[PDB]
Design an enzyme around this catalytic site. Structure first.
Site: not given
Lengths: 265, 266
Positions: B133, B135, B138, B155, B169
């Site tokens: 996040d 940006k 932040n 954040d 398997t």
């Protein structure tokens, strides 16, 4: 835990865990105690992270269905999270079927219906199991007339729920194009389980794990008569409608239950 | 322990996902912190509160991190209704707001702030943590009232550890699992490209007139450098951006490559 449950024999061991039989003090009821080793440092690759333990526990807490394993109690000590689980003693469904000389399509579908009913319940709560396979299909008690299927091992199960980013301005193409795994993955697994339940053959198994994975991705299987000569067309159609590459074109669990092969009993 | 026994609680600072942030002061030291109270989801509740899993995931990330360019977790408390994170107090506001206040800002000045972002991300990625996040909102400053403010990335609410993963398997696994490509550290490097593009120009490379257009533009990597927003931007800077805004995550610069790039290194 040892204050409240008397611990007995080791029953087995799996991903950072040991399972012991136990008996609850006061009630005398028997359970399986699964001791899960907690990861110490977040940088470590040993043990299970607290958040992954919680993810599994939160799913197990919600489950109340006869064809699913039940969680009774939980404890936590310095090194372990201990799940006190329903004791499932009847072994793997396929090991029970192995005691037989043969198995009819109608005998098989009795069991398949139970698996579908369990998965229908899980999917109704938006829970994808993600590791459906014969070893996670157990029996409560294999000695009764109509044994009861129990689905086990929610170790990689998830609740299936854009807004978290606020807006998409800064997000990469792989996030824009993110296609989450979902409930359809279980429906594919059900197709494979059905295929082997009816025929004894694994449809995609290759000589190496890598070959098997290639076969799965290509949807490279058939219904060769050497394996399917006593299998009905409706059974084959049911499988065909599950073993679809595009998850959005596979039958859902509701459609699976409405399929004529299943409705007929 | 209860949080009020160790901290004197003060005024409200903001709000998050089922969360309240209050200023506080540690008893015994007089040092100020931000206390973030996160409401726990009850077992009988579907959507109220934050899930225990999500709180643990974020906390385990915060506990691991210590670096000058990332917010520091100082203490954790839990009571009946909340988990309370005692966090470093980051008071300087958004980087981009501080920059927008400068009389002028040179490309060299911009690169020095960008380097701090890269240093924080280099640390995160060294722990296999994707922020996911990144940006402007932040990217904060610890204290804006100093000659050279320190960037703080905040954040970690969608951050994740980054690890065909099948121990048993593979015979029953669906094709979408066989072909699963998880989101990775490269996603942050893309974000840094977008951040840098806006940092230098004030324009956003992929933003369309509707959400769908923005999504389409990102997926197609459909952007260019407008002549009258990039007129004072160096080719070296454009090269840095070009090597981050790449569709295939495997062909994007890694954090190490970004730091070695001559725009940063020179």
């Amino acid at each position: 835990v040892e204050d409240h449950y008397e611990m007995g024999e080791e029953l087995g061991s799996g991903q950072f865990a040991i399972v012991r039989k136990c008996r609850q003090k006061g009630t005398g009821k028997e359970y399986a105690a699964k001791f899960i080793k907690k990861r110490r440092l977040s940088s470590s690759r040993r043990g299970v992270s607290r958040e992954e333990i919680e993810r599994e526990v939160n799913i197990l807490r919600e489950i109340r269905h006869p064809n699913i394993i039940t969680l009774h109690d939980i404890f936590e000590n310095k090194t372990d999270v201990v799940l006190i689980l329903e004791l499932v003693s009847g072994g793997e469904l396929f090991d029970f079927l192995a005691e037989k000389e043969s198995l009819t399509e109608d005998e098989a579908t009795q069991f398949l219906k139970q698996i579908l009913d369990g998965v229908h319940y899980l999917h109704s709560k938006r829970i994808a199991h993600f590791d459906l396979k014969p070893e996670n299909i157990m029996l409560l008690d294999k000695n009764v007339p109509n044994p009861r299927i129990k689905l086990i091992d929610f170790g990689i199960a998830h609740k299936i729920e854009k807004n978290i980013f606020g807006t998409p301005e800064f997000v990469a193409p792989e996030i824009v194009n993110y296609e989450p795994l979902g409930l359809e993955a279980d429906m594919w697994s059900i197709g494979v389980i059905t295929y082997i339940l009816l025929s004894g053959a694994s449809p995609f198994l290759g000589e190496t794990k890598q070959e098997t994975l290639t076969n799965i991705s290509a949807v490279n299987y058939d219904f060769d008569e050497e394996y399917f000569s006593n299998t009905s067309e409706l059974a084959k159609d049911f499988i065909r409608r599950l073993l679809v590459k595009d998850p959005k074109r596979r039958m859902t669990i509701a459609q699976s239950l409405e399929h004529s092969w299943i409705k007929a009993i």
